[PDB]
Ligand binder design. Structure first.
Ligand SMILES: O=C1C[C@H](Oc2cc(Cl)cc(OCCNC(=O)c3cc(=O)[nH]c4ccccc34)c2)N1
Ligand SMILES: O=C1C[C@H](Oc2cc(Cl)cc(OCCNC(=O)c3cc(=O)[nH]c4ccccc34)c2)N1
Ligand SMILES: [Cl-]
Lengths: 306, 302
């Protein structure tokens, strides 16, 4: 029993975190095989950041301008290149702790664990979702750039996020490990704003199933809805549209609890129109949208990652 | 910026998790140096769980009755002893992944990370607080016994909890790593109930300071209160009494934000009276009590 915001065990990723210094700037790097990946903005001064020409800034750097520290050991940079917004530093040593890994680009609504790092040292792990506006509501301070997000699928780490910046509203933006930003953001010190956010509907439904699995049933009702009627109501409350793919993905949870997806949609519609009436669901007075249907199944069934 | 429920990175603890089997029972063990620690109830059968005599059950076991598996390798048990409710299995190999560690007994209101495990394999990490009724609101299934709670301030792992059981209400009970239960619980299947739970007042105040540090000020007010009048109100909402130790502990956060502790107490009194009126504080519509003053400083300042 119980339902917590749970992150993947971070050990496989911790053994990849290094510190990258270029001049006065220090941030985190991810050391996999013989390459250290980090935000390309590590090469920028504060004035360069206003309108950077990264190709021009990079051509001026030599390998010795990058100091990479793995624990108390300095790694030797023997090459450097850029791929989109990520700098790739070739080092003379393959990381002996490199886990089985892939780089994956995730979609909004997908969740991942973030290993927040400072000076190449892991400080915390938390679970978050890629918001529909492509930001993450992370928790990051100065020096956190280069911290990564990941999932574990079987024994393979899938790296999906690298931290680059914090927007004026305190939300965060970053790239996949191929250096492509999530969202309409750029790596320049300029006024940038995230679009209006929406709630991840399929995730709220998954969390309602988690509540039912844990014995929280007060919000269940006798009613059902059509997908089209539910989507009209979802648009009204700034909820993401629920697709037939989402309905199929919730199938296993629907079969386990005996509550059809459109039956749970009718519970959600009533919750939006009327509120919780002083009640809570899984210790929350708001509808939680940072658990995917896979997260719910994984947590309610005890899947492990040795 | 931002404020999240954040756990410690679990790598140091993952490299210590092993599977312990005794007869038909399998659970998790913590392998540090040449000792594997686990709940002593691993030696019980289904017939023994209401009134086990652990000394009597243990004397009947040989080293070869304990199977310890670390990854795909079997460890050799060369000794066994009990310390309170924890079984200590001496093994023939020191764990090469043993981090710098200590065993600490925590007090209610304290927070820690839990590495939930099944069959000696880590499945997830989450943040918990030791409730005032000495339970934790974890997320554990069958086979989770022996999963541990810990903190990692600096490079030293402080193990503070070992999971033993789930109570009928779905909350969890366990021991420190010296085998002493937190609370009035025993490792017997007899009906046990946790006392009425209360909100950890000092932690709610710390989280209100975290909200102010992150730019949220809507809940502040021009009032202050005496400590005694605050406690008289807070108790009516099932909040733990706020002591002068708690007021002193909040001193650094009070100095950083410019909001005196009793001034923040008056904000808390108003929130308990009015609710949030459609507003949120740090993305929550309820008052959060699983962040300590130390957690807030660590997360906000680094
Ligand atoms: O709207 C916007 C943001 C963009 O400006 C940029 C662009 C780029 Cl590519 C990088 C950047 O800052 C990099 C250095 N940031 C940090 O260390 C940092 C990260 C964090 O998540 N939180 C912080 C909290 C306080 C202070 C520092 C941080 C800033 N324009
Ligand atoms: O009120 C109470 C509890 C005490 O009964 C005990 C005492 C002892 Cl020492 C052990 C025990 O169970 C050990 C085996 N528990 C589990 O695997 C288990 C742990 C968990 O946290 N959640 C579960 C969810 C479902 C099913 C199994 C679990 C039970 N009397
Ligand atoms: Cl403590």
């Amino acid at each position: 029993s119980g339902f917590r915001k749970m992150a993947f065990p971070s050990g496989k990723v911790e053994g990849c975190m290094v510190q990258v210094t270029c001049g006065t700037t220090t941030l985190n790097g991810l050391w996999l095989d013989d390459v250290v990946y980090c935000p390309r903005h590590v090469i920028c001064t504060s004035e360069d950041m206003l309108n950077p020409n990264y190709e021009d800034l990079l051509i001026r750097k030599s390998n010795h301008n990058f100091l990479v520290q793995a624990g108390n050991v300095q790694l030797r940079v023997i090459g450097h290149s850029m791929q989109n917004c990520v700098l790739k530093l070739k080092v003379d040593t393959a990381n002996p702790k490199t886990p089985k890994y892939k780089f994956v680009r995730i979609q909004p609504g997908q969740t991942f664990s973030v290993l927040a790092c400072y000076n190449g040292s892991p400080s915390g792990v938390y679970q978050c979702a890629m918001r529909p506006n492509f930001t993450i509501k992370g928790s990051f301070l100065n020096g956190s750039c280069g911290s990564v997000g990941f999932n574990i699928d079987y024994d393979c780490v899938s790296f999906c996020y690298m931290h680059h910046m914090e927007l004026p509203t305190g939300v965060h933006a970053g790239t996949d490990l191929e250096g492509n930003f999530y969202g309409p953001f750029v790596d320049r010190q300029t006024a940038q704003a995230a679009g209006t956010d929406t709630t991840i509907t399929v995730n709220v439904l998954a969390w309602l199933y988690a509540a039912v699995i844990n014995g929280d049933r007060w919000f269940l009702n006798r009613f059902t809805t059509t997908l089209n009627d539910f989507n009209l109501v979802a648009m009204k409350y700034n909820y993401e549209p629920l697709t037939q793919d989402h309905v199929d993905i919730l199938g296993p949870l629907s079969a386990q609890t005996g509550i059809a997806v459109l039956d749970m949609c009718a519970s959600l519609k009533e919750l939006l129109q009327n509120g919780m009436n002083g009640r809570t669901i899984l210790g929350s007075a708001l509808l939680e949208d940072e658990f995917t249907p896979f997260d719910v199944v994984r947590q309610c069934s005890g899947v492990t990652f040795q």
